[PDB]
Amino acid sequence: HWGYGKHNGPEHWHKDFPIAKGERQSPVDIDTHTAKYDPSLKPLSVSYDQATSLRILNNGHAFNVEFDDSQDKAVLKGGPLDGTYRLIQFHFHWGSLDGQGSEHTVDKKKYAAELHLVHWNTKYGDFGKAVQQPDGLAVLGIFLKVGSAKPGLQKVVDVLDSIKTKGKSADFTNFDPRGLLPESLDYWTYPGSLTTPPLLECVTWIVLKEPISVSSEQVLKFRKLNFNGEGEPEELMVDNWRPAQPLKNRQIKASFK
Ligand SMILES: NS(=O)(=O)c1ccc(NC(=O)c2ccc([N+](=O)[O-])cc2Cl)cc1
Numbered sequence: 001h002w003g004y005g006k007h008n009g010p011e012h013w014h015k016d017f018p019i020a021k022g023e024r025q026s027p028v029d030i031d032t033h034t035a036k037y038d039p040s041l042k043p044l045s046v047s048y049d050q051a052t053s054l055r056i057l058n059n060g061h062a063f064n065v066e067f068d069d070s071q072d073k074a075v076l077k078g079g080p081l082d083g084t085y086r087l088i089q090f091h092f093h094w095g096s097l098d099g100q101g102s103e104h105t106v107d108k109k110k111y112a113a114e115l116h117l118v119h120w121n122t123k124y125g126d127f128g129k130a131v132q133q134p135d136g137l138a139v140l141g142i143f144l145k146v147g148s149a150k151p152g153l154q155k156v157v158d159v160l161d162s163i164k165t166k167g168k169s170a171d172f173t174n175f176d177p178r179g180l181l182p183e184s185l186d187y188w189t190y191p192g193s194l195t196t197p198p199l200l201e202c203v204t205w206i207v208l209k210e211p212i213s214v215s216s217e218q219v220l221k222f223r224k225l226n227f228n229g230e231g232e233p234e235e236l237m238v239d240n241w242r243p244a245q246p247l248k249n250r251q252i253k254a255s256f257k
């Protein structure tokens with residue numbers, strides 16, 4: 001099945017998922033000088049005070065942490081969005097080396113990793129229905145650079161030892177994803193897709209300009225995870241990013257000048 005290798009990786013995904021060559025695929029290179037400053041964009045509202053984290057899951061592609069999204073908690077609104085979008089999960093994409101790992105790039109610059117906070121449009125009732133809609137999801141993307149540690153990341157780093165392998169999960173409550181957010185909520189936004197299969201064109205992307213800093217030690221711990229299941233040959237969970245895709249018709253908007 002699909003993955004990140006030479007024979008099944010991003011260049012192969014179009015065979016099982018033909019939308020891979022569609023008109024609104026993600027990620028993209030963010031050309032900061034062709035992006036349009038839009039003073040009409042309402043500020044972004046990220047309201048995570050009541051986010052109830054539940055569990056962290058290793059799925060064979062990344063580690064997904066899923067939230068209890070059964071109540072009106074942990075919502076993204078404003079910015080380019082109409083209505084309210086509810087947090088369901090976050091995950092990361094990262095590299096084998098500090099010089100790559102991000103999915104979006106900024107004037108061709110690759111960051112060490114990228115965090116995706118995934119939210120579904122509450123007008124569609126749940127995540128599974130929302131992904132079938134053109135405005136179903138809003139993904140908040142945040143770049144990671146290697147420097148000072150991010151203290152709010154450490155609780156995630158420490159649990160990774162227990163989910164080394166595909167299909168392992170651990171209880172993970174009371175985690176404040178506010179600890180993963182940079183100072184500024186300045187952003188770029190554009191219409192796109194999931195960056196893994198099924199590659200559905202259901203996402204309003206909101207990519208923050210300001211990266212967070214994490215330590216080398218923190219990202220090194222991401223790189224100890226495995227793609228393979230327990231009792232299969234060891235293949236380290238690294239370079240789980242899709243490269244930039246063609247922008248095609250699209251415009252990227254900026255919330256700042
Ligand atoms: N990398 S990204 O664009 O943020 C992104 C990519 C893929 C997803 N996928 C999911 O959330 C997902 C999880 C489970 C299932 N399922 O039915 O088993 C389906 C999806 Cl679409 C979410 C976000």
Ligand SMILES: [Zn+2]
Nearest residue numbers: 091093116195
């Ligand atoms: Zn992602």
